[PDB]
């Protein structure tokens, strides 16, 4: 399949490239027919069908109609799984800063333009204007002016002197500058005067902009013109028991973003005063920042719930984000657990396994072996046989268990001997029988401790269990040559 | 508790559902325990075929009942959801050369 | 069953490539393309492959020569 992965700043064109339609409403569903309202956070036209291979209206309803675009509802007919993949976008009226590049400890936007963070934040809040592209005037292309300064400033030069306020100003600052120019000069500056501060700001900024230019990402993309939206099935509105519905708070945040952006567009079309439109730009910035990463701002409260709302960065980062809880560690099929007992009669290379656990575990192999030996007509009949628990299937489980090792693990896994492979021995009861000599390797008392079992499915897994993770193959500790199978008490 | 193939979560394709089901969550420490051994395919089928690949689980079930022990792993679903969650931000994450 | 694989680690150094070669052999066996080289005492393809390895009659090179011969046999099937 594929090779190395790349990461970079998103061009608004690229954002629209991922995107198929623009969400223009804060609506989700119709509230009586729970069909998606087009075109909102949940939309069939933008994202896809609610049910597999069906239009929302139902005119092009048959499953043969693959790839056709409907014309009464504008829905493309495919599997509903694509309702979890396809993206959308929102066109922001006013530019908006990306809080990840603003509030990162070495502020990317701030450190990029050789500017302190407090001044940038004071500019984003419309507390003070800022110059851009002065040409030949008194001030340099970047400076801060209060409103009483901006009053009699433009009276000195109406043209050749551009001075805005807010996020548009930061975007104009990022677009006006082309970093080759500001790098060639830093060369001489960092060459002449020693001044440890000089070399420090030099190394940091010069490396930033040279590695910056090498890739090709443009500084203007730190300011968000278009906003990509998450697919709806990743933040679902699936109905719950009792008529109540369940949804991710993402929906609320995207809802606020859409609402405030549309209200800003309406205020622009209504010729609103500057105070109101500045307030609305600040509020839209607040909403976008709360969506991207909640916590570096006023920490928007939920709806009727006192806790904050899970944002996107809240979905990603943390010990419960998709990194620690999903990608590094994951729940596994073909697994079980139970309290453990002694089973001294066992030889070292085996463990006692309850009958019901081994039955529920090895179900697919049981079905396959039963239908291979002709004892079952089809797979449905095999499932019926095991659900009846007929007496013949126990010998089939004997057959499938003989040379098929299993993996045993205790909860406090410290070293690799915290997991060990054994040969299953069918046992009446509901407790796992673990060889006593291995208890020292497990630190497993018989004071109520529970252990888990896993089944190696593929041939490679079975051979890795028999040749590497086998209890017999692991007798000497890895930390020290001392044996780990030493008799205990 | 025991489970071979049960229900799966909707937000991310993971087995916890319902009575408790799903394996004893194969945490990072157990991943390290597998990494210390020379067992690589065990870990792969652990976090790709048995757990997160919506295609892989069924395409593996079919081969298991056919008597052929193989795996067409593909990509785990949590990583795809994370790709979408990153691309939801102003961050362009792509998949490069073949 | 096979309690210890130590002998298979002896005949093929690098106790990992033993797993890979034996998985290749057990895939040749389970997927019914081939048959065992040692009597099957009702062992699955795993222990049968390992017993083949212990007797020093199956490793990477022997299986690879067999595959390179089957390639030319299928080339002779061109007729």
């Amino acid at each position: 399949e594929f090779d190395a992965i790349k990461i970079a700043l998103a061009s608004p064109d690229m954002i629209r490239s991922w995107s198929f339609g623009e969400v223009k409403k804060p609506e989700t569903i119709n509230y009586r027919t729970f069909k998606p309202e087009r075109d909102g956070l949940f939309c069939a036209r933008i994202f896809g069908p609610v049910k597999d291979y069906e239009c929302l209206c139902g005119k092009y309803k048959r499953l043969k109609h693959r790839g056709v675009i409907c014309e009464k509802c504008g829905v493309e007919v495919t599997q509903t799984k694509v309702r979890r993949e396809r993206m959308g976008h929102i066109e922001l009226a006013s530019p908006t800063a990306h809080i990840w590049f603003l509030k990162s400890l070495p502020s990317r936007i701030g450190l990029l333009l050789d500017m302190p963070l407090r001044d940038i934040e004071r500019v984003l809040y419309f507390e003070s204007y800022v110059v851009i592209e002065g040409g030949m005037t008194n001030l340099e292309r970047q400076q801060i002016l209060t409103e009483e300064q901006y009053l009699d400033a433009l009276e000195e030069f109406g043209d050749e002197f551009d001075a805005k306020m807010g996020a548009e100003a930061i975007q104009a600052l990022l677009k006006s500058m082309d970093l080759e120019q500001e790098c060639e000069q830093l060369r001489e500056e960092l060459n002449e005067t020693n001044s440890e501060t000089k070399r420090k700001k030099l190394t940091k900024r010069i490396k930033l902009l040279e590695a910056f230019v090498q890739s090709g990402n443009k500084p203007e993309w730190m300011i968000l013109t278009v906003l990509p939206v998450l697919p709806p099935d990743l933040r679902p509105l699936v109905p719950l028991d009792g008529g109540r519905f369940a949804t991710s708070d993402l929906n609320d945040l995207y809802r606020r973003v859409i609402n405030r952006n549309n209200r800003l567009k309406r205020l622009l079309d209504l010729a609103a005063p500057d105070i109101i439109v500045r307030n609305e730009k600040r509020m839209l910035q607040e909403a976008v920042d709360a969506l991207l990463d909640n916590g570096r701002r006023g920490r928007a409260i939920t709806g009727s719930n006192k806790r904050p709302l899970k944002s996107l960065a809240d979905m990603i980062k943390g010990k419960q984000g998709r990194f620690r809880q999903n990608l590094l560690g994951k729940r596994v099929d073909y697994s079980g657990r139970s309290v453990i007992t002694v089973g001294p009669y066992l030889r070292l290379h085996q463990c006692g396994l309850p009958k019901k656990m081994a039955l529920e575990l090895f179900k697919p192999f049981i079905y396959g072996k039963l239908e291979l030996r002709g004892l079952a007509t089809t797979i449905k009949a095999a499932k019926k046989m095991v659900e009846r628990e007929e007496a013949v299937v126990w010998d089939i489980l004997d057959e499938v268990i003989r040379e098929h090792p299993v993996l045993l693990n205790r909860a406090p896994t410290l070293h690799r001997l915290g997991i060990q492979a054994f040969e299953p021995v069918l046992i009446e009861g509901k407790a796992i029988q673990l060889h006593p000599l291995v208890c020292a390797a497990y630190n497993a008392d018989f004071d109520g401790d529970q252990m888990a079992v896993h089944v190696p499915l593929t041939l490679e897994a079975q051979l890795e269990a028999r040749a590497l993770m086998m209890s017999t193959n692991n007798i000497l500790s890895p930390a020290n040559g001392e044996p780990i199978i030493v008799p205990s008490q | 508790h025991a489970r071979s193939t049960g229900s799966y979560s909707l937000v991310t394709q993971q087995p916890l559902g319902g009575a408790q089901f799903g394996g004893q969550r194969f945490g990072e420490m157990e991943v390290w325990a597998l990494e210390a051994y020379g067992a690589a395919y065990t870990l792969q089928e652990m976090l790709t075929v048995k757990s997160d690949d919506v295609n892989g689980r069924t395409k593996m079930y079919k081969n298991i009942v056919d008597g052929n022990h193989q795996m067409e792993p593909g990509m785990p679903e949590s990583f795809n959801v994370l790709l979408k969650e990153i691309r939801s931000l102003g961050i362009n994450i792509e998949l490069e050369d073949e | 069953a096979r309690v210890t694989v130590q002998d298979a680690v002896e005949k093929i150094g690098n106790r990992f490539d033993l797993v890979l070669v034996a998985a290749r052999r057990a895939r040749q066996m389970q997927v019914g393309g081939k048959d065992p080289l040692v009597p099957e005492e009702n062992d699955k393809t795993t222990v049968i492959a390992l017993r083949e390895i212990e007797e020093g009659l199956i490793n990477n090179q022997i299986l690879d020569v067999r595959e390179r011969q089957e390639q030319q046999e299928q080339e002779a099937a061109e007729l």
Partner: peptide, 13 residues
């Protein structure tokens, strides 16, 4: 682990 062999075949490729 095992994959190293496989991976050694790919990284060299």
């Amino acid at each position: 682990g095992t994959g190293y062999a496989y991976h050694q075949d790919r990284m060299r490729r």
